[PDB]
Structures are given as structure tokens and as C-alpha cells.
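[SOLVED] Need 3D model of a four-part complex

Original post:
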Amino acid sequence: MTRRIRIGGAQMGAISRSDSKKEIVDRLIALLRQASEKGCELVVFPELALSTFFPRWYAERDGMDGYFEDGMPNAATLPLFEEARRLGIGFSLGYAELVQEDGRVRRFNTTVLVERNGEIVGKYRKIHLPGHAEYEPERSHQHLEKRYFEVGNTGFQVWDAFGGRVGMAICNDRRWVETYRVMGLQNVELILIGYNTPVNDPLSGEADTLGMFHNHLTMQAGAYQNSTWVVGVAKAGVEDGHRLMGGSVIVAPTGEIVAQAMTEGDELIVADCDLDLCRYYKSHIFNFAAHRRPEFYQRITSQT
Amino acid sequence: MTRRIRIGGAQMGAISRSDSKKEIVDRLIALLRQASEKGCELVVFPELALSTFFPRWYAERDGMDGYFEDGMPNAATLPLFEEARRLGIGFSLGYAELVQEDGRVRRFNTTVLVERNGEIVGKYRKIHLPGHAEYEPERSHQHLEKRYFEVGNTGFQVWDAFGGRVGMAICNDRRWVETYRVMGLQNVELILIGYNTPVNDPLSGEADTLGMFHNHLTMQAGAYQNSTWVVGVAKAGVEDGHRLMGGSVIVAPTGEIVAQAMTEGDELIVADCDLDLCRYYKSHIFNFAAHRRPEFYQRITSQTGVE
Amino acid sequence: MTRRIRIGGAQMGAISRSDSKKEIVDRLIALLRQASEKGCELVVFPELALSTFFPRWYAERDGMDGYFEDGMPNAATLPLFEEARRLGIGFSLGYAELVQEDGRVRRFNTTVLVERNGEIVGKYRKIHLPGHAEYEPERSHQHLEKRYFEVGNTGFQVWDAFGGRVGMAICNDRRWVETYRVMGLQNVELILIGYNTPVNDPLSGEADTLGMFHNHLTMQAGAYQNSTWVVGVAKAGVEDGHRLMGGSVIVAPTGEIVAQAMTEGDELIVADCDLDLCRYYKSHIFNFAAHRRPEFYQRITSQTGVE
Amino acid sequence: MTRRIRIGGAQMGAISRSDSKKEIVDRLIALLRQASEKGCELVVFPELALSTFFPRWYAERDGMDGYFEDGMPNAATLPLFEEARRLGIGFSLGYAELVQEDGRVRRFNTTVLVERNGEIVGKYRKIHLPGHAEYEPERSHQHLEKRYFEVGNTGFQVWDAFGGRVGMAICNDRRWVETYRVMGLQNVELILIGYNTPVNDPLSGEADTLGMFHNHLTMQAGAYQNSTWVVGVAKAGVEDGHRLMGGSVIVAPTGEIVAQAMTEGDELIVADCDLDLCRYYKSHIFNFAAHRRPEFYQRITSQT
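Solution:
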């Protein structure tokens, strides 16, 4: 399915330890009305947008649940759904999902996708957990996503959404060619990726002069190599003495950046994304069929 | 120099269908000499570097063999092998392999890797063939590589060579994320990709402005996403009225471009390549613990096409 | 917000010499209505947006005038002025000016700046005419802009418009550093540069691979080195079998590109342009870290050519 | 080989306060032997190559004179020249020139251009002096070039050298379009620029994510808009807890980056540069005299 959709990249400034959830949620609602006054049918929020990036903070493995969410539409998060449904906007919202299964607690790094009528289209849970499970002393900053999260049971699902084929990856998911390719082989036309990337290297304690190089290099190639719109929205800023990288971008099926956010705070980038351009380029069978020969890709499934 | 090589990308200019072999090969020896004048240990030639791009010409499937190679070092291509052993320079060299194997003649888009002592390290046979096998008469130019080559039976091998782990791929293999991963998953540290990419669009008869963007884009993300050196050597220029893109690059395991050709002709670019950055960047994939999941990937190896 | 403008670049598809004026002007109006659906406060149109690129055509140095305008809002272009005022959108609009100034009949390559209330703020007349005065048979395509236009007598003016300071320049003006400097030295907050740039080089009849690279490069440094926004709007497409470059772009005062066009047809990009950033960077990137020493910059006015 | 010069960009690593000038001069001599053993005829050293970047340290205005130079072939630097002479290599060498005159003390940021036969082709002195003159506590790091240096009294001299037209500019000269334009109208074919660029912003003590962006964009467009080779060579590294960017590049008259350095340490980038390609572009359109209309450029001499 295919047509022409206006996406709002709703980049977020910092959130601190101090901030009340009401502030953060008003901050999302403000971006929402902005995308609304701009015709955006879909608006994309970042990873862990209801929170600070608490993986830089050491605590028992059940010591973060305050930052998590017991249900998706919450008392806390319910005005954000009322508004989105009232204005008839859909939104991808990254958050920290708290869920009970067999009587144990299960904690995922989740993004929920909600259709313009206000009803959930789905839920992705982060597959690639970066960081380390334990406290590692010789590092200027900490990254304990493994300590506070389990590998999601979702998989890389691509849904019939917003008049096209929509998929969702999360953050460092975007450095692995698998994330794009898996959703690719599903005819995905719109991959939504929210992200928090620290600006410095933890091993050296220094800034990665190549940080946005890599941030944009992985997404443009994904887009291009898979003929898919790719939307990357940042939570940037200095949270609690820790700077995150901005550079949110809407990327075309061809690899072209069409929208870039110049700040490290709340910023709504925006662009009209013909989903049908994707389906066209996917008709490369004309000449460059170069047809998938899975007989040779086998190593990708014994490891990767 | 803990494990460090001076690679040369010896990008080539045009080859007409009116060019003599000895011409083609003297040119190859020309660039091989150039490299020795710059202390190059490895030299990466282009794809199908002993012949014009005959995939743009129509003919019977067996009708192009006057271009192939009856053996890899033959009488024609022997002096290129001798002047490299003499100089102690390894090379990778792309050609059209004619071979009788499995009791019948076979035809591949091949690259051979020759180590400095003059000994063949490995062969790789192109997997991804683009284009069409029948004449498609609404395009400005024909891409008949499907008609003239068989898919390669090599796999994406990676070899102990030149002090590290060195694989090879050819042309539009550099469009497919798989090419790098598979090789990356054998601890590759250098990937030699020669190529021919017509500048004009086949179905538009007009240049792809994104021709070059896409060239360096896929190769740069490939170096990055597998912490591997990626050397891409073009054959470029107007060949019998068809212009081949240039842009030969040496790209570092950070994705950074460290050498670019600026001509569509015979040209050489040189960089020292620390094969150890690759080994180090792979074990700083620990804080960014992949702990990557091959269970979510199975779509990559199951279906050929797309659901 | 704080002196922010929602600017729209209205990149235009091709114009044949068969195209009616009603067609061209409706298309101009087409984009203007689009830009109102997106709440644009300014609409930057291309250069010579009221006719094709007749510099590619040989003719009497006075037998091009069916492409010129008798007056700036004329009976034909009147609708586009009306509909812009009726919606509250300012615009900048490139055209070919026929005026009986200094007694004689004078001909320029002009853009005009019109504000939201409907009132003309300024007019810039191209200073840098490229190409040649005469027919040049050894060039693949002709550029006769010197033969149909006189040098502009406006200077690089910078008016108070749209909440800040906005200047204008046209096409290959965006190549000469002088363009942004002069205008930036007048505290320009925003620069409108419409353009037609063929993709093929005139000697080779072959597309410059570094055609768009140069395009963005010269306009990005300009935005950067004068802490000014640079909105460059193309007319693009195959026009009567001549292809103009696309790549329209809004560049921020940092040098960053924040909106691009991916097509060579009628297309509109939008971006909120904080005119305050310009004045922020100006008193910081020109900190006491900058002092400009014009005693040494004296060749830029002394001579016109290299020595 | 002719109209064609093999340049080597001799990027340096850190020089800390605690180094001997014998360490430093050896490290430049080390680089010189690599350009010889790689074939270089001209080898370009960076700005302030004989000391740490002392303009980050507060002192009397004659206080940082131990980092300056008595005369150019010193006791300390005389081995660098003798070697360069033997290997028949010319070099650009940046340094803090101390020069006496009319009983007074004059102080410059100076690069000397030495020819392959060992003889000095000339000397440029920085015109564009960044930073401030007095101490300023509201910035995380200091620039006092204006305090310790004087505006140079050479201007952008272009000389005949290496079979071509060679000019010099220094460090943050490379941001001013006047640097390249002035030298281009002299038929410059090769602009040598050494530099030290702190990678944090002084005001915020934040890394300038655009730092290397900006570092390449000014030099590329300079090359292109003036049909010239532009060689840019850094001193990079952490000097006493202050970090300088790297990004040493040889740049074509097309504006194309043809060699780039990956480290923030001693690195020799090298490239073969047709000086005639300049004159091709210079006379294939891009004639200044044909389009230049300096009745309109007049503000460039009245204000800046």
C-alpha cells in the first residue's frame, strides 16, 4: 500500500532526573500540537521519551521501575492519547515497558505505534541491547541497558499503517544492516527509529568527532539499500551533565536527507513522504534484479 | 606497521572493443609499475579488467568468449604475473573466467587474488548478477551480464593473506548489505571490490545524479558496519560511447574515505592500511554489546524475494 | 517565534518554449497555493522563472524580447501578485526585465522581492553574467547570457524585509565569494538565490559528476562564512532536451542543509528559518576571535583578473 | 612527474608543555624521513609546530617567549633544515617568530617555506588573529593569540616555487574567503595551510559537532572557488587536557578531498598534485577578468 504522508520528527531536548512526568508529557503534547498545526498525520517521538536515559545510572536491576510504565495508556500518558486522537494524529512513542507474564516481571525497551483514529497499531521491543550488564569502572559514563532490559520478544514487525507499510526499530538497532533488511523483506516503506546516542565515547571519555557521521551513514544506507523512508528522531541535550546527540533526519528511499534538525532541544522537523516512491524503486527487477541468492547469506543466521 | 599494508587502487580508463589485449595488459603493467614507485604491497584492479564491458553488447550466450580467459595466467596475462612477482606486489585482478568444470564449460565473473610471491591466494566468483538475459529495447543501454555469466560457486570467501584476513567481492555485490556481513562474519579486515557502473540510467538514458552518492554510500557503510577496509576500484571512461563512473576510493574501517581518484582514466590512489584498527574496533564491540540475535534474522536466509 | 520565517523554496520543473505564459504562471501560482497549505510566509521562486532558458538559443541580441516583461506586475503576471497578497505570502521572483531606462531600452536578468502586504521591497539585477556573447560551435550547448543581458546596476542590496535583513543574488552569483560577503557585510540575515544550471558540461556534452557537489558546496560555505541563511531555488528538468540541475536547498547559517528537493520538477521545500541565529553567531563566531583586516584584502577591488 | 608535485601532509600529535624542543624537532625530522621514504618533494608541517599551543595559557604579554624562535635555523631547528636539504625535500614550517627591530620586540605567528635546495622561499605571518587579549573567566578554555602575537606584515604573498605558484595561510585564516581569493588573484596553484583548532567551544566547553564539517567546508570551497590545491595539516591530540581536532586533508582544485588522516597523532598524508590542472580550470571558464565586476565588491575594502 502507498500514498503520501506528512511525518513530524518530534525531536526532544533533555529530560533530567528532576523533571516531573507531567512536564515531560506536556512537552510531548506541545510537540504534538506543533506537528498538528503543521498538517502532520504521523509524528515520531524518540526512544525512552517518558523518562531520562537512566541506563547511565547504576541501581539494582529492579531499581529503575519508577522510570518505567505499568500500562501503555497511563494516567500519566493518557492526555497524550486524548490529544493525538482529538487532532487525528498518529504517533510512535518510545518508552520503558513494564509487563507481567507468568508472575515474573519483564522489562522491555519499547516503542508503541498508534493510528490516527487513536488505536494502537503495534509495539516493537528493542532486540539489540547495547552497553553492559555490570558496572564497569574504567569508563567516563555508564551504559547499563543490558542490566535494566531483556531482549524483546516482538521481532522486527512491519504493519499495514498510515496507508503504507510501517516498521519500527529502536536506537542502536540502526547500526545493524539486519534491522533494515529484515523489515525490508517485508516491503517496509517507513521505518521509524527513535534514539539516544551519547556524544562521548565511554571507553576514552572523549567526544566522537565521527558521531553524526555514523548516525547518518547507517540510516541513509538503510533507506537506500532497502528503498524505504527512514525517520530518525533524537532526544538530545545535556541531561544531568550528559550530552546526547541531535541531528534528527527524515531520510528518503534514495538515501537523501530531506529534513535535518539543527538544535539539541525540542524541535519538530517535518516532510511529506510519498510512500509510493518506495514501491517504484523496489521495481529494480527491470535491470538490476541481482536476485537474492540466500544460499550464500547463511552465515547471517548462525551468528551475525 | 603492526599489520599494515600500502594498498593501491589502480582504477582504469576506458577499454574499447577495438583495443588489443597487449594494450589492455601493458596498461595493467603500467599501473603495476606505478605502484612499485609508491611502495604498494597490494594492487586492486577492476572488475573484468582484461576486456571492455561486453555485457552492454548483445550476442549469443556463448558469443562473447573471445573476451574470456582460457586459463587465468595465460600467454597474454603471463607478463602481468611476472612483473608482479619481480616487484613483490600482490594483486587482485578481475576477468571473465572460461573453465571446463563439472564436465561442461562454465563462465563466471571472477577475481583472483595473487600474493606477493606470485602465488594465487584465492578466487571469488560473482554471486549477484544484475540486468537481463534478453535484449530489452526500451532502455538506452543493455546490461546482459545475466546472459553471459553463471552465478558464482565460490561463496564469499575470506583468506589469510597480506598479513590479515582479506576477502573479495565484485561490482553490485557492494549494494547488498549481505556481502559485507558474511565476510565480516569471518573476521575480514580488507575487502577488494572492483567494478563497472554505467553512469546513465538504463531506463532513463540520462545520468544518475545519485550515481556517485550511492557508490561511496554503500561502500562506506560497509566498512563501518563490519570494521573492515573496503577498497573499490573502478574501470571508468567512455567505452564505445558509454561512460563508466569513476570515484575509486579507499575507505577505512571507520567508514572514512582516505583516497579518491578524480579521473575517468588510468589512475592510481594509495593509502597505508593498518589492518589492526579493524581488529581493535571489533573488540570495542563490547560496550556496544551487540549480543546480536540471529533468531530475528531468519528472513535473510529463507525467502529469495520479498513478502 | 523570535524573528522566524517559514520560507518555501519553489523549485520549478522544465519550461519548453512551447509553454504558454498562462501555463507558467499558473504553475507559479500552483506552487504559491501549495506554500500556503504549509503556512509559508515567503516563497522563493527560481531565476528566469517566467520563461525557459533562452540563453541556450542563438538569436538577434534584441530578438529575445518575447521572453521579457513589459512591467513587473504586468497583465499576465498580475494574477500571481494578486493571489500572493490575497493569501499573505511574500515572494522573490526571477525574470527578464525590459525597461526603457536612461532613455534607452535596457535588459537585465532580474529578481524582484515582494512582501506579504503585496508591496515590492527591492529588485536585484545580475552582476555576474556567464557564458559568451557569440555562438561557440565546439560547445555541446550554448550559454549566451552575456549576449541577452547587460550587467546589473543594483549592487548586492540588503533590505529590511520579513522581520530581518534579506538580500538577493542570482544563479552563478552563488559561486563568487564576493556575493555573500558584500551582502553579509550589510548584516544580511537571509539570501535568496534562484538558478538554472545545466547538468552537462558544454565542452564534453557530458554531465559533471561534481555538478551538485559544487552547487551545494558554494552555497553552504556562503551561509556559513556570513552566518546567513541561503535559500537557493532551482528551475530543473529537461527543457527542450536540455537538462537543468535540481538540488534546491535551504541552508542554515551554520552551513547545514535543512531541506532538499529530490526531484527535477515542480517541487516545494519548507523550513522554519530563525533569523535570530544569524545575529547570535555574528557576535560570537565574529567574537573578538575575528578581526577583519581590509588593508590586505585590497586585490578584490584593485583588479578584475589574475596576475 | 612534471607540473606535478608530491606533497606530504605532516600532521602532528600533541606537544605538551613538558616536552623538550629536541623531542619535537626529532618528531618533525621523523615525519620528514617518511615523506622522503614515500617520495615527497614538499612536506607540510602545521601551525606552531615547535611548541605546544601556548595561546591557551594566561601569562604576561612577553611571558610566552620560550616558545618563540631566535632566528629561523636555530641551534634547536638546524638539524631539521640540514636533513631536509640532504633528502632534497622542501617544507612549510609553522612557529612563533620573535623578531627585533627599531630597538623593539615584534612577535608573529609565522610559517617559513623552505625550498628543496635548503633555501628559504619566503615567510607568511598570520593576519587573522583569533581569541582575545585579556583573561576571560566565562569560557572553559582560552585563546590569547591577540595577546601574544601581532598582525603580520606580509599579507598573502604568493611565490614561485616547486615549479608552481605557492601561497601560505595559517590556521583560522582558512575561514575567511579573503584568504583564498587574495591569493587566487595571484594565480595561486597550491595553498599551504597549517592549523590548530581546539575542538571544544570556548563559551560552553562543548565539542563543536560541526568542527570537522567546518574544517573541511572552508578549505574545500576555497580550493574550488579559486581553482587551487589546498593542503591542510593539523597539530592534533590532547595537549595537557586540551584536545585539538585532526582532519588533515589534501584538497584538489575541484574541491575534492583526495587524502585524509584518521588519527589525532603524527600522521603523513600524501598525494600527487598536478599544478597544471589548476591552470586548466583557471582558463577553462572561471576567468576572474571575464566576470569580475569589482565596482560592486567595494565593501570588502572599507569595512572588512
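Edit: The interface with chain A takes residues 199, 206-207, 209, 211-212, 238, 243, 245-247 of chain D (CB under 8 Å).
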